Amino acid sequence: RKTRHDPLAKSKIERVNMPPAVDPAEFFVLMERYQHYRQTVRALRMEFVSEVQRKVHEARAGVLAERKALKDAAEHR
Amino acid sequence: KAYRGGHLTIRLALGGCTNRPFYRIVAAHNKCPRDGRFVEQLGSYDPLPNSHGEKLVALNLDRIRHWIGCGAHLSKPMEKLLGLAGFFPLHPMMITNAERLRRKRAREVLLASQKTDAE
Amino acid sequence: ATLNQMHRLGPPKRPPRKLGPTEGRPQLKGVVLCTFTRKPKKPNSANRKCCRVRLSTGREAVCFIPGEGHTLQEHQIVLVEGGRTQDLPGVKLTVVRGKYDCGHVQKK
Amino acid sequence: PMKGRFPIRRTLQYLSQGNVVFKDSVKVMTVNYNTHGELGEGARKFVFFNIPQIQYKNPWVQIMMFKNMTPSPFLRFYLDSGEQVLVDVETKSNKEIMEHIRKILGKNEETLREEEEEKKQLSHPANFGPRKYCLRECICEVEGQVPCPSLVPLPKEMRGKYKAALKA
Amino acid sequence: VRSSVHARWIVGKVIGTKMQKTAKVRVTRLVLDPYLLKYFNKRKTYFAHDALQQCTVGDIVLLRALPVPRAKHVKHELAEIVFKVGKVIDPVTGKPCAGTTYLESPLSSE
Amino acid sequence: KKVRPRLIAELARRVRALREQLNRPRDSQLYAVDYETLTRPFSGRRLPVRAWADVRRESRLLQLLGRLPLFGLGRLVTRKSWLWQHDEPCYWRLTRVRPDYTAQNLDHGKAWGILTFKGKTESEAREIEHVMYHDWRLVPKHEEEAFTAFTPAPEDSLASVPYPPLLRAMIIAERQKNGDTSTEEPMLNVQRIRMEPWDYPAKQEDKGRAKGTPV
RNA sequence: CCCCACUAUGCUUAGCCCUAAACCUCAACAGUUAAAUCAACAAAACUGCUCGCCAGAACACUACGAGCCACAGCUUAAAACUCAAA
RNA sequence: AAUAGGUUUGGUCCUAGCCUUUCUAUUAGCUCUUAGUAAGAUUACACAUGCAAGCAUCCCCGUUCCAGUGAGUUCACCCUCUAAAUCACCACGAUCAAAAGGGACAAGCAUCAAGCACGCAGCAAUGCAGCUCAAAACGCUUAGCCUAGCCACACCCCCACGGGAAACAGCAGUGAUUAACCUUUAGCAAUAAACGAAAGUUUAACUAAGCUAUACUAACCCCAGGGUUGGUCAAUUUCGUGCCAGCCACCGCGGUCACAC
Ligand code: FES
Ligand SMILES: [K+]
Ligand SMILES: [K+]
Ligand SMILES: [K+]
Ligand SMILES: [K+]
Ligand SMILES: [K+]
Ligand SMILES: [K+]
Ligand SMILES: [K+]
Ligand SMILES: [K+]
Ligand SMILES: [K+]
Ligand SMILES: [Mg+2]
Ligand SMILES: [Mg+2]
Ligand SMILES: [Mg+2]
Ligand SMILES: [Mg+2]
Ligand SMILES: [Mg+2]
Ligand SMILES: [Mg+2]
Ligand SMILES: [Mg+2]
Ligand SMILES: [Mg+2]
Ligand SMILES: [Mg+2]
Ligand SMILES: [Mg+2]
Ligand SMILES: [Mg+2]
Ligand SMILES: [Mg+2]
Ligand SMILES: [Mg+2]
Ligand SMILES: [Mg+2]
Ligand SMILES: [Mg+2]
Ligand SMILES: [Mg+2]
Ligand SMILES: [Mg+2]
Ligand SMILES: [Mg+2]
Ligand SMILES: [Mg+2]
Ligand SMILES: [Mg+2]
Ligand SMILES: [Mg+2]
Ligand SMILES: [Mg+2]
Ligand SMILES: [Mg+2]
Ligand SMILES: [Mg+2]
Ligand SMILES: [Mg+2]
């Protein structure tokens, strides 16, 4: 692809990007679906993020991790 | 190759040969090439029906949840796969495209009947 | 040698392979400067047709012209390949018959 | 033939037969032994036969030897916490020395089994890629799936050369 | 306990004491010769901080990594003199020795 | 191993940063527009088609404030796009204004204020975005009471939604594996997921600015 | 090559020069005489350990560089062209 | 170098080089039916022309990516620390990953053997004289690499304020050059990327085509060529030539019965 230093094409100087036509009924329904969909996906992302954080803390300062750390320290002595 | 900004994305990397597409589901930096370096492979997707008439999709759900929990984004085709699997809700455009297809075929059925009626 | 000595010297080092008259290339383009005949070393006897060409690399070299009869002249273009003429000392290049100005041998 | 006495020591098979894999705390292992004396015979065979096996399994642990510095042989381990472990080896055989250090500072068979399992998780059988990393390169290798076009030409209907031709 | 220095604990031989409060230590490690599959010593130099200037050329010392290097080449400090040159104390018996011979019999203190 | 210093790189890096602060373009240059062609003479780039009608009809914020005492501190300003999109009052209460003195009509600059979007007011003032847009209207003084009048409607919003079919089946299968015999349905909590309208004023402080390169 | 004469030189002193078929062409140290004793010849065949050295012939006790009280020297020491042998 | 083979001599044994037989790639000669697939300038030399970055109610964001090349070349890996970035917003967190610190990391030449400030202590002032090196420092030469990819470069002056000067090492294409030689096609339908709240828009990435025995797979009623035929090494009849013309990878053949031209 081009870089910001490459010049603009001359066959595209007068190009005007016209926006699509809108169907009011479908536009409104689709807008509400995206809100509900993204609210549910954000609720799922929050749970997955909490699981990742719970597993990291558990492996660091969990009851089974601190218990195995004391056992190894006792066996050493 | 440290990129300026960017983020991890779960997306489809195209494999296979000419006229024989095959996708690998990978977590990779969004700035990396489509089929280049990735962080982890999270599954695969064969879009061509097999001998049993099935499209096979493998999903490493344990690792998919891990990478989403680490801040990974999802490409639109990946979101639709998870919707079809029941892991995510159906994407808003899978629902809307289905409705568009119903209206399209409702007009064709109406045109066909009007032609037979004229006959 | 002992194990200590083998460890200290390391793995053997192949002599850097020497490039032949083609300078490690399949063929070279040349311009004919003059034609002449050479006598082979004993016990062979003949007047082997050769020529001096200016290679595309700027170097001048003698080249053997294989086959019965040729029509090469000064200022003509030829393609030269490797392979020494066994009984012509110093001749390590061969003209390719049927390329550029050097045509194929005429039948019988 | 291979040079030196007991050339079996200079083979990968022999070096991998060591059963001592130090815990992560071990950082240095010094060996003090005497070149002569019947009571230091086991320590000399330990340096001759076992030190290579220990170093091979523990590449990042410093091992340094010292000759004829004290009247009797001994091992000393320096741990990351700063603790030092002295092991008197006079009168012991090289096999008894290996079994001793394995008991006090070596990883047990359970800890080693677990580590090997966590490695197998890195090569998932279901992943596709180069042979260096994966079992199969493409799904076309799985029986029942559409095979590769390089071996079985696809039907004309599944080829873009004729999809565009009919559409165009 | 963390440290940016790579070598945390290393034993070596003092080979120089000409720098102020710094001992130059030679550290040897066993490195496998891939072709011969024989281990050979590989030596490396370390500068160790010696605040009391107690190191003598030839003694065996234990070096501890510093939290951060105190100089361009000084990344360690003298943690302990293992074997003082010509004044070794047998760790097994705690008695002074001269090579493979005792200077004080272990039977002296029972 | 010691990388050779690259002094010309550091020198040029500082000279560029300096020239970007001493030759920085002003708002009157960046945000000027040719109302006949609807292009910015600073870069020659046209505006999007959906903005053409408003660029010829609506005013920029500083076009309104440049006509008021103290540049209109304390006044309420709303946007035509908000008036069309929402029935609840949306407006800024101005607290600070930095006019672009280089503009002949003082119709460019920055502004700060307290946001009231759809009847809900924020606690602290912040910088206002889209100050250069042709979209602003000044609320008359004799209309402030009737314009700001708002009664909060009951936030009767859903609290929990189900899990997707597969996620639900896996959560339930995990319960039964661990001996749990509960029949309660797994539910996603969406109370904490507050969905802002896409036209909610973003943080202007964290927004970039066009670099100097006048055409 | 044979005969005669005579000089540098062979000697002493004080400094250099640093070479030899300086070869008993057989490295130092430790050990063996049993096994397969061993291409040939030479001065029987081997083991452990260490250092030095070698890898077709010729070019070459050479060229160049470097060092040296050496200035037609010594030490270290290549390559190109050539042959299918030596 | 192997299961090895040919060749030193009047002859034998030993040693030894060279070559033969195997498998790839490029180029050349002669020859060539189809289909599918993969791959595809000699040149960091110079480039005509077209296209390769937009999006979007203005702000911004993107054009720092992708794609290209291999000139230069121990910036690629591990650890410590810690920015920017993602997780809407905080995340005392995770993920990802710079700068900085520690460690590790190509080849040849030692006829490159010494480098010449290359160290340490001290709050500072300043003091000490050290630091690297035959376990190869310092130096010269060669080379992209350890390939799910990575590093480096982006006309040159290592850099790019400035200067020389006016840039295809983006796609297609051209000139010169080399033994080395793909179309100045189509489409954003799939995937990926940018932007948008979104329907969507854009993209010479990519996808689907074009060209070429360079390779793989399969096939064909008709359609086979190329090279060899003294030994190594599978396989020659009759003539012509007469140490001439010519031939061989090695040993050799040709001086009138040449299985070697
Ligand atoms: S390798 Fe799988 S389709 Fe070709
Ligand atoms: K002859
Ligand atoms: K000599
Ligand atoms: K002799
Ligand atoms: K041979
Ligand atoms: K934008
Ligand atoms: K690239
Ligand atoms: K390169
Ligand atoms: K450069
Ligand atoms: K597309
Ligand atoms: Mg011959
Ligand atoms: Mg006299
Ligand atoms: Mg006398
Ligand atoms: Mg003598
Ligand atoms: Mg000796
Ligand atoms: Mg030789
Ligand atoms: Mg001599
Ligand atoms: Mg000489
Ligand atoms: Mg000289
Ligand atoms: Mg003979
Ligand atoms: Mg090159
Ligand atoms: Mg941060
Ligand atoms: Mg870094
Ligand atoms: Mg030497
Ligand atoms: Mg020289
Ligand atoms: Mg070097
Ligand atoms: Mg190069
Ligand atoms: Mg160019
Ligand atoms: Mg540059
Ligand atoms: Mg091009
Ligand atoms: Mg080609
Ligand atoms: Mg196009
Ligand atoms: Mg193609
Ligand atoms: Mg005849
Ligand atoms: Mg013939």
Side-chain angles (χ1 to χ4, degrees), chain C residues 85-104:
Chain C
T85 314
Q86 288 82 341
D87 59 358
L88 295 181
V91 184
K92 300 181 285 295
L93 294 174
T94 296
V95 177
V96 178
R97 302 302 303 260
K99 186 67 171 180
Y100 298 144
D101 294 352
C102 194
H104 291 282

mmCIF file of all heavy atoms in Angstrom, chain C residues 85-104:
data_model
loop_
_atom_site.group_PDB
_atom_site.id
_atom_site.type_symbol
_atom_site.label_atom_id
_atom_site.label_comp_id
_atom_site.label_asym_id
_atom_site.label_seq_id
_atom_site.Cartn_x
_atom_site.Cartn_y
_atom_site.Cartn_z
ATOM 1 N N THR C 85 40.294 -28.987 -22.474
ATOM 2 C CA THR C 85 40.725 -29.818 -23.591
ATOM 3 C C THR C 85 41.944 -30.606 -23.122
ATOM 4 O O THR C 85 43.019 -30.034 -22.917
ATOM 5 C CB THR C 85 41.043 -28.968 -24.817
ATOM 6 O OG1 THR C 85 39.997 -28.013 -25.022
ATOM 7 C CG2 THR C 85 41.168 -29.844 -26.056
ATOM 8 N N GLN C 86 41.772 -31.919 -22.961
ATOM 9 C CA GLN C 86 42.730 -32.715 -22.199
ATOM 10 C C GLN C 86 44.159 -32.549 -22.704
ATOM 11 O O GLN C 86 45.096 -32.453 -21.905
ATOM 12 C CB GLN C 86 42.325 -34.191 -22.234
ATOM 13 C CG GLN C 86 41.088 -34.523 -21.408
ATOM 14 C CD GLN C 86 39.791 -34.229 -22.136
ATOM 15 O OE1 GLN C 86 39.768 -33.476 -23.108
ATOM 16 N NE2 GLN C 86 38.705 -34.832 -21.673
ATOM 17 N N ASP C 87 44.351 -32.513 -24.022
ATOM 18 C CA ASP C 87 45.690 -32.514 -24.599
ATOM 19 C C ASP C 87 46.167 -31.133 -25.036
ATOM 20 O O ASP C 87 47.226 -31.035 -25.660
ATOM 21 C CB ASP C 87 45.748 -33.481 -25.789
ATOM 22 C CG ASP C 87 44.765 -33.125 -26.883
ATOM 23 O OD1 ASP C 87 44.004 -32.152 -26.715
ATOM 24 O OD2 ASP C 87 44.757 -33.823 -27.916
ATOM 25 N N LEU C 88 45.427 -30.071 -24.723
ATOM 26 C CA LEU C 88 45.864 -28.706 -25.008
ATOM 27 C C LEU C 88 46.191 -28.004 -23.696
ATOM 28 O O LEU C 88 45.280 -27.509 -23.016
ATOM 29 C CB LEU C 88 44.785 -27.932 -25.772
ATOM 30 C CG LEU C 88 44.439 -28.416 -27.180
ATOM 31 C CD1 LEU C 88 43.383 -27.514 -27.792
ATOM 32 C CD2 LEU C 88 45.677 -28.471 -28.062
ATOM 33 N N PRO C 89 47.458 -27.934 -23.292
ATOM 34 C CA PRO C 89 47.787 -27.285 -22.017
ATOM 35 C C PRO C 89 47.339 -25.830 -21.996
ATOM 36 O O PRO C 89 47.616 -25.063 -22.920
ATOM 37 C CB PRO C 89 49.313 -27.410 -21.938
ATOM 38 C CG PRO C 89 49.650 -28.553 -22.826
ATOM 39 C CD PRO C 89 48.649 -28.516 -23.934
ATOM 40 N N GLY C 90 46.638 -25.456 -20.927
ATOM 41 C CA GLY C 90 46.194 -24.094 -20.732
ATOM 42 C C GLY C 90 44.831 -23.770 -21.304
ATOM 43 O O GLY C 90 44.270 -22.722 -20.961
ATOM 44 N N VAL C 91 44.280 -24.625 -22.159
ATOM 45 C CA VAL C 91 42.974 -24.391 -22.763
ATOM 46 C C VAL C 91 41.922 -25.001 -21.844
ATOM 47 O O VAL C 91 41.820 -26.224 -21.729
ATOM 48 C CB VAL C 91 42.896 -24.982 -24.175
ATOM 49 C CG1 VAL C 91 41.560 -24.650 -24.819
ATOM 50 C CG2 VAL C 91 44.047 -24.468 -25.025
ATOM 51 N N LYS C 92 41.139 -24.145 -21.188
ATOM 52 C CA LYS C 92 40.154 -24.583 -20.206
ATOM 53 C C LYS C 92 38.738 -24.142 -20.552
ATOM 54 O O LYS C 92 37.824 -24.356 -19.749
ATOM 55 C CB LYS C 92 40.533 -24.065 -18.815
ATOM 56 C CG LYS C 92 41.883 -24.552 -18.320
ATOM 57 C CD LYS C 92 42.199 -24.018 -16.929
ATOM 58 C CE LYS C 92 42.584 -22.547 -16.956
ATOM 59 N NZ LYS C 92 43.857 -22.310 -17.694
ATOM 60 N N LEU C 93 38.529 -23.535 -21.716
ATOM 61 C CA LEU C 93 37.216 -23.079 -22.142
ATOM 62 C C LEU C 93 36.863 -23.702 -23.485
ATOM 63 O O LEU C 93 37.740 -24.028 -24.289
ATOM 64 C CB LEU C 93 37.166 -21.551 -22.249
ATOM 65 C CG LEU C 93 37.316 -20.779 -20.938
ATOM 66 C CD1 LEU C 93 37.384 -19.286 -21.206
ATOM 67 C CD2 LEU C 93 36.175 -21.100 -19.986
ATOM 68 N N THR C 94 35.563 -23.862 -23.717
ATOM 69 C CA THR C 94 35.054 -24.489 -24.930
ATOM 70 C C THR C 94 33.918 -23.644 -25.483
ATOM 71 O O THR C 94 33.049 -23.200 -24.728
ATOM 72 C CB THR C 94 34.561 -25.916 -24.650
ATOM 73 O OG1 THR C 94 35.660 -26.734 -24.230
ATOM 74 C CG2 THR C 94 33.928 -26.524 -25.889
ATOM 75 N N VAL C 95 33.927 -23.424 -26.797
ATOM 76 C CA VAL C 95 32.847 -22.689 -27.440
ATOM 77 C C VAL C 95 31.625 -23.588 -27.565
ATOM 78 O O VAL C 95 31.740 -24.793 -27.828
ATOM 79 C CB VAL C 95 33.295 -22.165 -28.815
ATOM 80 C CG1 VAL C 95 32.146 -21.457 -29.515
ATOM 81 C CG2 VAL C 95 34.484 -21.235 -28.668
ATOM 82 N N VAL C 96 30.446 -23.005 -27.376
ATOM 83 C CA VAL C 96 29.187 -23.734 -27.481
ATOM 84 C C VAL C 96 28.735 -23.681 -28.936
ATOM 85 O O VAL C 96 28.386 -22.615 -29.448
ATOM 86 C CB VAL C 96 28.121 -23.152 -26.545
ATOM 87 C CG1 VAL C 96 26.804 -23.895 -26.708
ATOM 88 C CG2 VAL C 96 28.595 -23.204 -25.100
ATOM 89 N N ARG C 97 28.741 -24.830 -29.605
ATOM 90 C CA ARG C 97 28.287 -24.892 -30.988
ATOM 91 C C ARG C 97 26.775 -24.723 -31.046
ATOM 92 O O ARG C 97 26.037 -25.373 -30.300
ATOM 93 C CB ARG C 97 28.694 -26.219 -31.629
ATOM 94 C CG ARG C 97 30.191 -26.499 -31.629
ATOM 95 C CD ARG C 97 30.977 -25.420 -32.353
ATOM 96 N NE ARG C 97 30.539 -25.241 -33.733
ATOM 97 C CZ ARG C 97 31.146 -25.749 -34.798
ATOM 98 N NH1 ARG C 97 32.238 -26.490 -34.690
ATOM 99 N NH2 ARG C 97 30.648 -25.505 -36.005
ATOM 100 N N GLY C 98 26.316 -23.848 -31.932
ATOM 101 C CA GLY C 98 24.901 -23.601 -32.103
ATOM 102 C C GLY C 98 24.329 -22.488 -31.255
ATOM 103 O O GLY C 98 23.139 -22.539 -30.929
ATOM 104 N N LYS C 99 25.130 -21.491 -30.890
ATOM 105 C CA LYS C 99 24.680 -20.380 -30.065
ATOM 106 C C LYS C 99 25.353 -19.101 -30.541
ATOM 107 O O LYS C 99 26.570 -19.070 -30.746
ATOM 108 C CB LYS C 99 24.999 -20.629 -28.585
ATOM 109 C CG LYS C 99 24.435 -19.591 -27.628
ATOM 110 C CD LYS C 99 22.920 -19.630 -27.580
ATOM 111 C CE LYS C 99 22.379 -18.750 -26.467
ATOM 112 N NZ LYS C 99 20.894 -18.773 -26.404
ATOM 113 N N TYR C 100 24.554 -18.053 -30.718
ATOM 114 C CA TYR C 100 25.038 -16.747 -31.187
ATOM 115 C C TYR C 100 25.614 -16.955 -32.587
ATOM 116 O O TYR C 100 24.905 -17.482 -33.459
ATOM 117 C CB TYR C 100 25.999 -16.161 -30.157
ATOM 118 C CG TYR C 100 25.370 -15.888 -28.808
ATOM 119 C CD1 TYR C 100 26.087 -16.081 -27.637
ATOM 120 C CD2 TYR C 100 24.059 -15.441 -28.706
ATOM 121 C CE1 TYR C 100 25.519 -15.834 -26.403
ATOM 122 C CE2 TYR C 100 23.484 -15.192 -27.478
ATOM 123 C CZ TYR C 100 24.217 -15.391 -26.330
ATOM 124 O OH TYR C 100 23.644 -15.143 -25.104
ATOM 125 N N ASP C 101 26.862 -16.572 -32.851
ATOM 126 C CA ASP C 101 27.411 -16.640 -34.200
ATOM 127 C C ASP C 101 27.999 -18.000 -34.546
ATOM 128 O O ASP C 101 28.188 -18.288 -35.734
ATOM 129 C CB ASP C 101 28.489 -15.568 -34.383
ATOM 130 C CG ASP C 101 27.929 -14.161 -34.312
ATOM 131 O OD1 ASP C 101 26.690 -14.011 -34.272
ATOM 132 O OD2 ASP C 101 28.727 -13.202 -34.294
ATOM 133 N N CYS C 102 28.289 -18.839 -33.557
ATOM 134 C CA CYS C 102 28.850 -20.164 -33.804
ATOM 135 C C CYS C 102 27.705 -21.139 -34.054
ATOM 136 O O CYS C 102 26.961 -21.484 -33.132
ATOM 137 C CB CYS C 102 29.709 -20.618 -32.628
ATOM 138 S SG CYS C 102 30.749 -22.044 -33.003
ATOM 139 N N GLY C 103 27.567 -21.585 -35.304
ATOM 140 C CA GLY C 103 26.502 -22.497 -35.663
ATOM 141 C C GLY C 103 26.863 -23.950 -35.412
ATOM 142 O O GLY C 103 27.984 -24.288 -35.040
ATOM 143 N N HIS C 104 25.878 -24.817 -35.622
ATOM 144 C CA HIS C 104 26.090 -26.245 -35.442
ATOM 145 C C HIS C 104 27.015 -26.789 -36.524
ATOM 146 O O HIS C 104 27.130 -26.231 -37.617
ATOM 147 C CB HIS C 104 24.758 -26.992 -35.477
ATOM 148 C CG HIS C 104 23.878 -26.715 -34.299
ATOM 149 N ND1 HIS C 104 24.077 -27.302 -33.068
ATOM 150 C CD2 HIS C 104 22.791 -25.918 -34.165
ATOM 151 C CE1 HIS C 104 23.152 -26.877 -32.225
ATOM 152 N NE2 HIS C 104 22.361 -26.036 -32.866
#
